[PDB]
Amino acid sequence: MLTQKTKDIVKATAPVLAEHGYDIIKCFYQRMFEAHPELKNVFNMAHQEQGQQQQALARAVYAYAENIEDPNSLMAVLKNIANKHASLGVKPEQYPIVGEHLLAAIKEVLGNAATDDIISAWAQAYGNLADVLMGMESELYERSAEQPGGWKGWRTFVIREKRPESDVITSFILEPADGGPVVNFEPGQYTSVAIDVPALGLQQIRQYSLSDMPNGRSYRISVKREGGGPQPPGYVSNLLHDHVNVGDQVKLAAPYGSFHIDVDAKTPIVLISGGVGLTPMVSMLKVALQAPPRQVVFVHGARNSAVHAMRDRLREAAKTYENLDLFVFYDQPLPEDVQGRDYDYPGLVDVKQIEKSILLPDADYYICGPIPFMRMQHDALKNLGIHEARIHYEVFGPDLFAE
Ligand SMILES: Cc1cc2nc3c(=O)[nH]c(=O)nc-3n(C[C@H](O)[C@H](O)[C@H](O)COP(=O)(O)OP(=O)(O)OC[C@H]3O[C@@H](n4cnc5c(N)ncnc54)[C@H](O)[C@@H]3O)c2cc1C
Ligand code: HEM
Ligand SMILES: Clc1ccc(CO[C@@H](Cn2ccnc2)c2ccc(Cl)cc2Cl)c(Cl)c1
């Protein structure tokens, strides 16, 4: 457990790790894969541009520093990471490998700046978070395994159907190779697919949102084909589209993820969408509007009219449910869109503009859309005094730009 002095070090130095985040990450993978090349089968080996990797890390580090004295906020951010790690199959015996190489990378990159006090303080933070995470992941694994139709680790599924939904999105329906039941999931949760990538000579693992509602027998995912032409094609989405056919097998993780409505709560729901389409948002809006009624606000951050399937489904729901309050932002309104009949406000969702409308007692907030959108909205809500534990967000479905 960290003393106040050691928390103080972490706090004063988090911006330092952040500022050097790109170099630290590069050195970390280099050192780790050199000792433990088998971990390339669990980590994502596709290249992501520099800024993106720097930011992700900066963000994790700042999230930790900000909540290092607030147990309830800290646990809220940890459970999100526990869910992802449990989806990936992270094991307790891997924590000492990651901590050794992460510390050594911190020292190497920071060079002189990496004082004895700083390395030791961050080694402590590592040991404390690893303890928390291991216990949380073990709970997840055990709870999944005890559910009817649940399991630990990889379970083999068969593609029962494969249907294009657009020229680039294809829906896959999966049933377990053993023919047994499959455990329920809530809208917003994901599976992971683990598959051998022949071009890499490695397994890769990717998360896919689980569509529709559970039925005890099968799962459905919608997979967007990534890249091609100017864009170098993505490994797993292209592999699913072009080589994974009806009758072929894939390995799935049990459903995980903390982004979902608590069907047992009675408190208000603020859904904030940054461009996600009718599928899969509809399943989640359905859960929000199940009886007994809860106050539901939907904040729809769209382009404009050009696609309006989600705007229309929402307007219809707002006519049946007096407990649904709808707000629309169009960031680039079409010449033909007028403020007041086609949308409410110009630009990206701006929560200060609707404060009184969304700042509801004991609400939970559910943000989805592009990753920078979710982050912007997360931080806006934190600035209004909302606790970390009441803000939820995740990649949700195959098209964060559908509307
Ligand atoms: C919780 C969660 C839920 C998700 N749900 C869905 C879902 O329901 N449906 C869905 O389709 N996806 C979903 N995703 C995205 C999915 O997990 C994969 O990330 C996606 O399928 C792309 O993986 P890939 O292996 O095909 O691409 P990767 O090979 O990992 O590449 C990723 C991107 O990088 C591009 N790229 C190639 N070379 C470079 C380079 N030079 N520099 C920068 N970029 C490059 C690729 O074209 C691709 O666009 C979800 C992700 C998460 C985290
Ligand atoms: C205290 C120690 C650890 C911390 C704080 C930590 C933190 C994080 C964070 C913040 C994410 C991003 C989560 C998200 O995108 O939602 C992540 C993802 C991930 N973690 Fe960890 N983690 C730790 C240990 C481990 C261990 C021991 C493993 C074992 C291999 C591991 C493997 C992964 C993988 C494979 C991902 C997905 C990203 C990718 O594939 O490149 N982590 N973790
Ligand atoms: Cl106490 C503490 C624990 C872990 C870390 C960084 O941990 C690495 C390593 N990692 C990668 C996935 N899971 C862990 C990390 C994590 C998230 C991201 Cl986005 C990139 C990286 Cl390089 C730090 Cl700075 C301090």
XYZ file of C-alpha atoms and ligand atoms in Angstrom:
524
model
C 0.000 0.000 0.000
C 1.421 3.453 -0.937
C 2.458 5.951 1.656
C 1.457 9.666 1.100
C 5.107 10.492 0.156
C 5.100 7.865 -2.486
C 1.674 8.959 -3.817
C 3.167 12.466 -3.967
C 6.039 11.299 -6.151
C 3.620 9.518 -8.468
C 1.499 12.631 -8.746
C 4.412 14.974 -9.358
C 5.953 12.674 -11.997
C 2.961 11.427 -13.995
C 3.317 14.378 -16.392
C 6.937 13.350 -16.910
C 6.053 9.745 -17.943
C 3.296 11.256 -20.118
C 5.604 13.639 -21.892
C 7.969 10.757 -22.711
C 5.186 8.261 -23.376
C 6.106 7.357 -26.968
C 9.725 6.482 -26.156
C 8.713 4.571 -23.036
C 6.189 2.437 -24.969
C 8.748 1.605 -27.752
C 11.464 0.606 -25.266
C 8.911 -1.376 -23.186
C 7.830 -3.533 -26.125
C 11.375 -3.939 -27.370
C 12.641 -5.173 -23.952
C 9.582 -7.281 -23.206
C 9.381 -9.086 -26.575
C 13.088 -9.745 -26.466
C 12.730 -11.660 -23.168
C 9.234 -13.016 -23.875
C 8.490 -13.219 -27.583
C 5.481 -15.419 -26.933
C 3.607 -12.267 -25.732
C 3.337 -10.979 -29.278
C 0.442 -13.463 -29.456
C -1.544 -11.457 -26.839
C -0.461 -7.867 -27.667
C -1.625 -5.990 -30.800
C 1.209 -6.110 -33.320
C -0.346 -3.872 -35.948
C 1.193 -0.466 -36.142
C -0.705 2.484 -34.751
C 0.596 6.006 -35.430
C 2.791 7.583 -32.604
C 0.363 10.233 -31.256
C -2.316 7.657 -30.635
C -0.027 5.410 -28.587
C 1.423 8.389 -26.656
C -2.109 9.615 -25.856
C -3.506 6.291 -24.723
C -0.695 5.924 -22.277
C -0.729 9.564 -21.097
C -4.416 9.124 -20.439
C -3.996 5.925 -18.321
C -1.272 7.576 -16.338
C -3.206 10.779 -15.744
C -6.280 8.749 -14.817
C -4.229 6.950 -12.189
C -2.602 10.123 -10.775
C -5.902 11.970 -10.561
C -7.614 9.159 -8.622
C -4.676 7.873 -6.562
C -6.338 9.313 -3.347
C -9.891 8.437 -4.239
C -10.452 4.660 -3.815
C -13.923 4.724 -5.413
C -12.865 6.627 -8.525
C -9.673 4.424 -8.819
C -11.748 1.185 -8.725
C -14.108 2.566 -11.381
C -11.196 3.095 -13.805
C -9.559 -0.225 -12.870
C -12.679 -2.280 -13.584
C -12.593 -1.093 -17.141
C -9.049 -2.352 -17.503
C -9.879 -5.644 -15.624
C -12.659 -6.313 -18.195
C -10.309 -5.829 -21.203
C -7.508 -7.916 -19.621
C -10.086 -10.695 -18.791
C -11.316 -10.519 -22.428
C -7.646 -10.846 -23.634
C -6.982 -13.794 -21.108
C -4.318 -11.887 -19.078
C -2.800 -14.213 -16.415
C -1.382 -13.415 -12.983
C 2.041 -14.882 -13.845
C 2.413 -12.240 -16.616
C 2.359 -9.242 -14.199
C 5.993 -9.680 -13.027
C 7.107 -9.756 -16.780
C 5.285 -6.568 -17.634
C 6.413 -4.778 -14.474
C 10.100 -5.634 -14.927
C 10.213 -4.373 -18.550
C 8.011 -1.334 -17.911
C 10.325 -0.156 -15.064
C 13.432 -0.858 -17.061
C 11.929 1.130 -19.967
C 11.074 4.013 -17.649
C 14.690 4.104 -16.395
C 16.177 3.798 -19.900
C 14.138 6.577 -21.527
C 14.146 8.968 -18.597
C 17.942 8.395 -18.230
C 19.139 10.979 -15.665
C 15.629 12.217 -14.818
C 14.730 8.672 -13.643
C 15.806 9.078 -10.026
C 15.843 6.214 -7.514
C 12.813 7.736 -5.797
C 10.856 7.901 -8.991
C 11.568 4.293 -10.118
C 10.761 2.932 -6.687
C 7.539 4.970 -6.402
C 6.332 3.774 -9.807
C 7.412 0.131 -8.945
C 5.180 0.460 -5.945
C 2.292 1.854 -7.921
C 2.765 -1.082 -10.333
C 2.707 -3.709 -7.547
C -0.423 -2.106 -6.015
C -2.405 -1.861 -9.305
C -1.287 -5.358 -10.396
C -2.638 -6.720 -7.056
C -6.002 -4.937 -7.592
C -6.232 -6.004 -11.246
C -5.303 -9.661 -10.622
C -8.011 -10.026 -7.948
C -10.599 -8.239 -10.138
C -9.699 -10.366 -13.207
C -9.858 -13.590 -11.094
C -13.361 -12.544 -9.960
C -14.398 -11.965 -13.504
C -13.060 -15.345 -14.657
C -14.702 -17.139 -11.789
C -18.054 -15.415 -12.201
C -18.054 -16.194 -15.990
C -17.148 -19.874 -15.428
C -19.982 -20.356 -12.877
C -22.684 -18.940 -15.211
C -24.665 -21.409 -17.289
C -23.034 -21.304 -20.731
C -20.049 -19.323 -19.378
C -16.407 -20.323 -19.522
C -12.779 -19.266 -18.866
C -10.258 -18.697 -21.602
C -10.939 -19.548 -25.258
C -14.090 -21.499 -26.380
C -14.271 -22.639 -30.024
C -17.201 -21.295 -32.085
C -18.433 -22.112 -35.675
C -19.715 -19.493 -38.135
C -23.279 -20.442 -38.848
C -24.004 -17.508 -41.108
C -22.213 -14.711 -42.719
C -24.162 -11.821 -44.168
C -22.977 -8.516 -45.746
C -24.765 -5.559 -44.216
C -22.962 -3.018 -46.378
C -20.178 -3.331 -48.952
C -17.812 -3.218 -45.972
C -19.681 -4.537 -42.873
C -20.492 -8.244 -42.514
C -22.443 -9.861 -39.780
C -21.272 -13.241 -38.433
C -23.522 -15.490 -36.393
C -21.527 -17.847 -34.121
C -22.555 -21.021 -32.292
C -20.304 -22.944 -29.977
C -18.539 -25.962 -31.528
C -19.618 -28.032 -28.505
C -23.317 -27.272 -29.165
C -23.818 -26.184 -25.524
C -25.454 -22.997 -24.175
C -23.692 -19.578 -24.134
C -23.808 -17.171 -21.252
C -25.835 -13.929 -21.475
C -24.319 -10.525 -22.140
C -25.650 -6.960 -21.846
C -25.745 -4.422 -24.786
C -22.369 -2.594 -24.918
C -20.361 -5.668 -23.953
C -17.896 -7.360 -26.297
C -16.279 -10.726 -27.063
C -12.735 -11.151 -28.183
C -11.814 -13.128 -31.245
C -8.352 -14.826 -31.098
C -7.157 -16.064 -34.506
C -3.838 -17.048 -36.160
C -2.739 -14.384 -38.630
C -0.756 -16.142 -41.384
C 0.925 -12.872 -42.487
C 2.344 -12.341 -38.987
C 2.963 -15.976 -37.962
C 1.228 -14.919 -34.680
C -2.138 -15.022 -32.966
C -3.865 -11.660 -32.749
C -6.902 -10.846 -30.604
C -9.578 -8.193 -31.382
C -12.712 -7.168 -29.528
C -16.166 -7.193 -31.218
C -19.402 -5.720 -29.804
C -22.018 -8.330 -29.181
C -25.182 -7.473 -31.236
C -28.893 -7.916 -30.445
C -29.891 -9.566 -27.168
C -28.713 -12.835 -25.710
C -30.771 -15.996 -26.624
C -28.761 -18.684 -24.777
C -27.508 -20.307 -27.982
C -25.608 -18.036 -30.389
C -23.866 -14.659 -30.659
C -23.741 -12.187 -33.483
C -20.974 -9.677 -34.354
C -20.768 -7.031 -37.143
C -17.221 -6.637 -38.490
C -16.153 -3.657 -40.534
C -13.482 -4.503 -43.183
C -10.556 -2.150 -42.379
C -8.230 -0.560 -44.880
C -7.404 -1.396 -48.501
C -6.070 0.865 -51.287
C -4.296 3.898 -49.693
C -4.760 2.276 -46.248
C -2.701 -0.845 -45.482
C -5.512 -3.442 -44.689
C -6.152 -4.494 -41.058
C -5.142 -8.029 -40.059
C -8.133 -9.593 -38.369
C -11.076 -7.738 -40.035
C -9.779 -8.717 -43.521
C -9.041 -12.253 -42.351
C -12.694 -12.625 -41.045
C -14.155 -11.199 -44.320
C -11.998 -13.174 -46.760
C -11.038 -16.425 -45.108
C -13.398 -17.150 -42.337
C -16.472 -18.749 -43.881
C -19.654 -20.560 -42.853
C -18.489 -23.787 -41.105
C -15.087 -22.407 -40.123
C -14.087 -22.133 -36.396
C -12.813 -19.239 -34.295
C -11.916 -18.896 -30.587
C -14.051 -16.522 -28.484
C -13.675 -15.032 -25.052
C -16.710 -14.898 -22.763
C -18.555 -11.493 -22.794
C -16.849 -8.780 -20.827
C -16.935 -5.002 -20.552
C -18.338 -2.515 -18.016
C -20.087 -0.362 -20.581
C -23.723 -1.236 -20.216
C -26.914 -0.280 -18.440
C -27.492 -1.723 -14.972
C -30.915 -3.256 -15.537
C -31.339 -3.130 -11.651
C -30.875 0.568 -11.206
C -33.802 3.013 -11.203
C -31.711 6.119 -11.677
C -31.508 8.439 -14.751
C -29.716 7.401 -17.948
C -27.844 9.894 -20.069
C -26.803 8.332 -23.387
C -24.341 10.473 -25.359
C -23.604 9.289 -28.928
C -20.839 10.709 -31.067
C -21.759 9.019 -34.369
C -22.753 5.389 -33.663
C -25.541 3.976 -35.929
C -28.905 2.243 -35.446
C -27.077 -0.988 -34.860
C -26.008 -1.511 -32.298
C -27.267 1.544 -30.393
C -30.899 0.372 -30.622
C -30.331 -2.616 -28.212
C -28.948 -0.284 -25.572
C -31.746 2.357 -26.039
C -34.193 -0.596 -25.686
C -32.630 -1.577 -22.404
C -32.798 2.090 -21.248
C -36.570 2.269 -22.007
C -37.619 -1.075 -20.423
C -40.260 -0.780 -17.664
C -40.297 0.233 -14.896
C -39.623 3.712 -16.479
C -36.353 5.567 -15.810
C -35.569 9.097 -16.895
C -33.648 8.815 -20.122
C -31.873 11.627 -21.957
C -30.439 10.901 -25.426
C -27.722 13.309 -26.683
C -27.147 12.689 -30.348
C -23.963 14.143 -31.784
C -24.229 13.688 -35.525
C -22.865 15.097 -38.883
C -26.126 16.222 -40.393
C -29.180 14.905 -42.297
C -27.161 12.985 -44.922
C -27.793 9.896 -42.802
C -30.677 10.182 -40.382
C -31.740 6.591 -39.443
C -30.674 7.140 -35.825
C -32.231 10.672 -35.669
C -35.560 9.192 -36.920
C -35.646 6.067 -34.669
C -34.926 8.451 -31.785
C -37.699 10.960 -32.698
C -40.213 8.088 -32.841
C -39.146 6.769 -29.392
C -39.424 10.353 -28.037
C -43.070 10.383 -29.205
C -43.999 7.110 -27.303
C -41.962 7.749 -24.113
C -42.659 10.928 -22.170
C -39.535 9.944 -20.025
C -37.143 10.265 -23.057
C -35.641 13.739 -23.636
C -33.775 13.966 -27.007
C -30.997 16.468 -27.930
C -29.383 16.735 -31.375
C -26.127 18.356 -32.369
C -25.083 18.574 -36.062
C -21.393 19.640 -36.307
C -21.457 20.280 -40.019
C -25.088 21.118 -40.890
C -26.037 20.614 -44.494
C -27.131 23.820 -46.276
C -30.617 22.383 -45.967
C -30.497 21.710 -42.121
C -32.068 24.501 -39.979
C -31.486 24.927 -36.217
C -34.760 24.028 -34.535
C -36.400 21.566 -36.995
C -33.534 19.264 -38.215
C -31.275 19.584 -35.136
C -30.965 21.478 -31.805
C -27.373 22.907 -31.817
C -24.422 23.415 -34.261
C -21.080 21.594 -33.613
C -20.069 18.586 -31.470
C -21.943 17.672 -28.335
C -21.318 20.363 -25.770
C -22.640 19.435 -22.285
C -22.334 22.980 -20.879
C -24.955 24.003 -23.454
C -27.475 21.510 -21.957
C -26.141 21.402 -18.283
C -29.522 21.703 -16.560
C -30.839 19.061 -18.908
C -28.174 16.359 -18.234
C -26.831 17.131 -14.785
C -29.418 14.974 -13.098
C -29.116 13.551 -9.549
C -27.470 10.103 -9.425
C -27.381 9.767 -13.209
C -25.139 7.445 -15.147
C -23.600 8.583 -18.362
C -22.970 6.344 -21.396
C -20.751 7.754 -24.146
C -19.986 6.111 -27.408
C -18.683 7.229 -30.831
C -15.059 8.025 -31.993
C -12.372 7.640 -29.362
C -11.435 11.345 -29.176
C -15.173 12.126 -28.837
C -15.581 9.780 -25.826
C -12.511 11.308 -24.182
C -13.680 14.901 -24.809
C -17.112 14.028 -23.274
C -15.602 12.130 -20.381
C -13.495 15.175 -19.477
C -16.386 17.667 -19.978
C -18.546 15.687 -17.513
C -15.689 15.378 -14.983
C -15.471 19.203 -15.194
C -19.103 19.475 -14.149
C -18.402 17.489 -10.988
C -19.645 14.043 -12.148
C -17.851 11.170 -10.381
C -15.682 8.866 -12.398
C -17.829 5.879 -11.333
C -20.932 7.349 -13.122
C -19.234 7.856 -16.526
C -19.047 4.891 -18.875
C -17.624 4.610 -22.374
C -16.397 2.047 -24.899
C -15.983 1.345 -28.553
C -19.417 0.198 -29.570
C -20.075 -1.581 -32.941
C -18.480 -1.474 -36.366
C -18.867 2.203 -37.356
C -18.143 5.076 -35.046
C -19.048 7.447 -37.999
C -22.355 6.044 -39.112
C -24.131 9.321 -38.426
C -14.389 -2.787 -27.028
C -14.217 -2.846 -28.545
C -15.339 -3.189 -29.342
C -15.169 -3.264 -30.733
N -16.297 -3.654 -31.523
C -16.194 -3.689 -32.884
C -17.293 -4.050 -33.644
O -18.388 -4.358 -33.162
N -17.091 -4.135 -34.997
C -15.903 -3.814 -35.614
O -15.777 -3.917 -36.851
N -14.835 -3.449 -34.855
C -14.960 -3.390 -33.492
N -13.843 -3.006 -32.760
C -12.557 -2.736 -33.546
C -11.884 -4.144 -33.643
O -11.561 -4.593 -32.339
C -10.626 -4.110 -34.518
O -9.815 -3.109 -33.967
C -10.903 -3.869 -36.015
O -11.648 -4.993 -36.460
C -9.611 -3.638 -36.823
O -8.681 -4.722 -36.575
P -7.770 -5.340 -37.614
O -7.016 -6.534 -36.991
O -8.524 -5.649 -38.860
O -6.825 -4.098 -37.912
P -5.258 -3.807 -37.423
O -4.320 -4.637 -38.284
O -5.020 -4.002 -35.957
O -5.027 -2.245 -37.892
C -5.848 -1.239 -37.300
C -5.963 -0.069 -38.256
O -4.685 0.368 -38.655
C -4.643 0.533 -40.062
N -3.215 0.509 -40.436
C -2.511 -0.383 -41.209
N -1.216 0.009 -41.261
C -1.077 1.132 -40.512
C 0.019 1.956 -40.232
N 0.950 2.029 -41.185
N -0.148 3.066 -39.395
C -1.389 3.397 -38.870
N -2.460 2.569 -39.180
C -2.319 1.461 -39.984
C -5.565 -0.553 -40.593
O -6.128 -0.358 -41.876
C -6.645 -0.489 -39.560
O -7.521 0.532 -39.966
C -13.940 -2.930 -31.365
C -12.838 -2.585 -30.551
C -12.975 -2.564 -29.146
C -11.790 -2.158 -28.303
C -0.711 -3.035 -13.140
C -0.408 -3.534 -14.366
C -1.208 -3.151 -15.651
C -1.873 -2.002 -15.968
C -2.090 -0.693 -15.185
C -2.436 -2.112 -17.284
C -3.197 -1.162 -17.898
C -3.805 -1.273 -19.110
C -4.603 -0.272 -19.788
C -4.905 1.111 -19.212
C -5.012 -0.807 -20.951
C -5.851 -0.113 -22.011
C -7.229 -0.542 -21.644
C -8.269 -0.089 -22.700
O -7.907 0.255 -23.864
O -9.466 -0.095 -22.384
C -4.463 -2.121 -21.069
C -4.622 -3.034 -22.104
C -3.936 -4.214 -22.348
N -3.166 -4.935 -21.439
Fe -2.680 -4.123 -19.580
N -2.126 -3.346 -17.757
C -1.350 -4.016 -16.813
C -0.913 -5.323 -16.925
C -0.982 -6.185 -17.990
C -0.451 -7.544 -18.093
C 0.338 -8.318 -16.996
C -0.691 -7.995 -19.336
C -0.233 -9.353 -19.825
C 0.152 -9.563 -21.079
C -1.376 -6.957 -20.091
C -1.850 -6.989 -21.389
C -2.647 -6.069 -22.003
C -3.060 -6.135 -23.395
C -2.686 -7.280 -24.418
C -3.937 -4.918 -23.635
C -4.646 -4.463 -24.966
C -3.751 -3.539 -25.801
C -2.851 -4.243 -26.830
O -3.151 -5.403 -27.248
O -1.794 -3.705 -27.286
N -1.549 -5.921 -19.208
N -3.805 -2.350 -19.922
Cl 1.688 1.734 -12.165
C 1.696 1.522 -13.920
C 1.200 0.395 -14.518
C 1.274 0.304 -15.907
C 1.795 1.370 -16.666
C 1.885 1.300 -18.170
O 1.743 -0.037 -18.590
C 2.102 -0.169 -19.941
C 2.249 -1.659 -20.330
N 0.915 -2.334 -20.675
C 0.331 -2.432 -21.932
C -0.849 -3.075 -21.756
N -1.036 -3.396 -20.393
C 0.077 -2.908 -19.786
C 1.009 0.501 -20.731
C -0.259 0.613 -20.230
C -1.224 1.223 -21.009
C -0.913 1.725 -22.278
Cl -2.168 2.496 -23.311
C 0.367 1.615 -22.795
C 1.299 0.993 -21.984
Cl 2.931 0.815 -22.589
C 2.295 2.491 -16.052
Cl 3.052 3.826 -17.017
C 2.248 2.565 -14.662
